[PDB]
Amino acid sequence: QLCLRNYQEELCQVALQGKNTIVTAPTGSGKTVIAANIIKEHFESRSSEGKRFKALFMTPNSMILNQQAASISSYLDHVYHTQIIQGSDNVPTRNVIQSKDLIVATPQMIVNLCNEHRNSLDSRLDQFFLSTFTIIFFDECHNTVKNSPYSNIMREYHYLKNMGNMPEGHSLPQIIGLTASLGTGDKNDCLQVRNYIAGLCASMDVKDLSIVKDNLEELRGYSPIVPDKVLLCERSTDGPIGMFTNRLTLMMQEVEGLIRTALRNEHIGSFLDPPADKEHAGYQNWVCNQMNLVSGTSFRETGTRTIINEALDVLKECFCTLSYNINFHPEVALNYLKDEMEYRTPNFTVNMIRIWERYHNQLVGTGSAENPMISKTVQYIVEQNLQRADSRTIIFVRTRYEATILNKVLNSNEELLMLGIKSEWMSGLNKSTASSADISASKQKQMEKLKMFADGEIRILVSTSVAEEGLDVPECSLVIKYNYATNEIAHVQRRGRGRALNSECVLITNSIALRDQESNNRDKESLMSETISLIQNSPAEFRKCVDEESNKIWPRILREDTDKAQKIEEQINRNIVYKIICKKCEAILCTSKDIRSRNTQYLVCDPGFWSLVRKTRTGSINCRRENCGLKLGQLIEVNTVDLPCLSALSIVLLVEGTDKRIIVKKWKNILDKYFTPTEIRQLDVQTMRDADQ
RNA sequence: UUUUUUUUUUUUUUUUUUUUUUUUUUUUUU
RNA sequence: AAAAAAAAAAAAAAAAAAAAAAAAAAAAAA
Ligand SMILES: Nc1ncnc2c1ncn2[C@@H]1O[C@H](COP(=O)(O)OP(=O)(O)O)[C@@H](O)[C@H]1O
Ligand SMILES: [Mg+2]
Ligand SMILES: [Zn+2]
């Protein structure tokens, strides 16, 4: 058992009244202990009064699910049965919910429950009720905006409260809200922030706020504040870094001129001129927009489109390496450019090959240099190591590739290797980011990385925003934000991540925008503190407008059915065909009648698809057309035979007759706007014949 | 030889959150 | 003409979850 603290007991007293309350406590103050104590008290009261009891615990991140469940079980002395429900587990949910008094499950499963009965063909396996659980908990409730799963659970709770489907004597469940910070959002004055906070609380049917009143000293002592030092490094326009930047701008102008001649050959006078600045995101946005127009238009010459797409891809890569050279030393940017260019080489023309070889020779002759930010970070690391031998440093970066580059830079310095200091490349488990080719993000790998950091083998953690919440990150003695800026909640979580004694938070950047964002975040935090103080001072909130306006639940569904009918009427157009072709090159991949879907995977049963595909080796699908290098999808097997799987992001839909190009981002749009493929039959036969020989 | 359960890896699709940049519209001020 | 605020569209980056499928390794049964 764990002894309750004074502020924890004060927070628990507010929720002990049975009303819906939201608890706002700093990270690491023991929200899990408070939740477990509230659950235990509610269960004891229900047992004393002689009625059924049930508790539901929900967390946005599955990484912290096991730790939270273990802590809850330990606090409850393992007297009540607990079961963890995740996507991997195939155990039925309703049976374990009925047979156990404490259920911990992903909120999406709760959303699916009591809602899957709708739009289901006739039985319907009865209907589940949200009010089955006596007490529910909403960890990290600040994300309950727009159409979040928490918003869906709130809508189900409103269904149960308003509509008269209560079975026998079912009572309204009590929900406790726990979050680090409510979230300013985009409001400016205190009144708007207070109104937004009150509306968010009303969306969860919460009227009372659990805020510490007289135990602030204990909270400050147990959770000391961490100053947020701001450090800025000036940029150097001269030296090897300046020479590298000049060479890359020369490459910018050369590629722009080549694009100009390519457009002139097409006799096209509409394309937008590139921005003068080659380092801002405006150049990348313009490149992406030009690529979108090129995909959405038709060209007289087939090779011109391929050349333009190759130029746009090289421009994007060169912008990425410009950002890398701005953030770090030119060595990593040169290495990234070299590996990307050597990967894309077998699909290039002779002139571009010579241009790249000349530019690479010039960059090799440039030399090397060191960035002031890297030197400052290294000096801070050695200073922390001198202060204590158990120093732990966590570094936040923008992208996963940025994390890998930072880890390589830190591991390449002999000054840290003299004392035996290593680093890692901690990232997130998400695989849908368009940059997952170099990212593994395995669950076991992440657990192993956490274990080695906890054991002390790894000192520097180049971790992304994933580690801010839902991760069992141990105490860190130094938090560094390497050109990374996020919202107020993420900044607060980063500041609170330094649970080690005398933790220091220092921000290192070379851009005025980062400093402005940090100042804005500090101002937002101060405004939140002022609003919280004002709310505490005045107990008469007198806020009920959103609570009464929340009666619009059924009009929402009414308009939902109306515009669903309108979308169905719009979709009624059919019996037409599509000439699906490759995005980069005008090659007939297949026709609209050769695409089939088994469950949710879209496979093309084209006998001639093998002749126009490369079939590399992992397994991947690549265009066989020269100078294309486009990944049309992934190769998968269902009947022990590999079959092609097209991707919407690598194909362009063409309509027969008029030359109207169609761009598709997700398969849902083409599914519900253009056509629907038929169900799969024993069509792997004709595909397997032509797969071999 | 087949079936059931557990673990690891991989793939497709769908539903959300946060940050930055670009563009458009409206209002206010100089 | 310039600046600020609000809404909308596009692009980039990061994070979360769900559904299904495939491969491999173990335990049990036929
Ligand atoms: N009353 C208490 N007695 C002992 N340990 C506590 C107490 N309250 C909190 N802790 C410890 O402090 C930590 C606080 O982190 P926790 O509340 O679990 O996650 P979060 O970061 O969401 O607040 C817990 O891991 C817990 O072990
Ligand atoms: Mg928590
Ligand atoms: Zn192609």
Residue numbers in the entry: 290 to 411, 414 to 560, 579 to 926, 940 to 1015
Authors' text:
While some invertebrate Dicers act alone during antiviral defense, Caenorhabditis elegans Dicer acts in a complex with a dsRNA binding protein called RDE-4, and an RLR ortholog called DRH-1. C. elegans is of keen interest in this regard because its single encoded Dicer functions in complex with an RLR homolog to mediate an antiviral RNAi response. The antiviral complex in C. elegans includes Dicer (DCR-1), the RIG-I ortholog called Dicer-Related Helicase-1 (DRH-1), and a dsRNA binding protein called RNAi deficient-4. Like RIG-I and MDA5, DRH-1 has an N-terminal domain (NTD), a central helicase domain, and a C-terminal regulatory domain (CTD). DRH-1 plays the dominant role in ATP hydrolysis, and like mammalian RLRs, has an N-terminal domain that functions in autoinhibition.
To understand how ATP hydrolysis was coupled to cleavage, we prepared cryo-EM specimens of DCR-1•DRH-1•RDE-4 in the presence of ATP, and added Ca2+ in addition to Mg2+ to inhibit dsRNA cleavage. Under these conditions, we obtained a 2.9 Å reconstruction of the helicase and CTD domains of DRH-1 bound to the middle region of the dsRNA, rather than its terminus, suggesting that DRH-1 hydrolyzes ATP to translocate along dsRNA. The ATP-binding pocket at the interface of these domains contained density for ADP and Mg2+, stabilized by contacts from well conserved helicase motifs including Q, I, Ia, II, III, Va, and VI. In the CTD, we observed a patch of lysine residues (K987, K988, and K990) that make extensive contact with phosphates in the RNA backbone. We also found that the CTD contains a zinc structural ion that is conserved with RLRs (see arrows pointing up). In the absence of nucleotide or in the presence of ATPγS, our cryo-EM structures show DRH-1 binding to the end of dsRNA, while addition of ATP shows DRH-1 localized to internal regions, consistent with the idea that DRH-1 translocates along dsRNA.
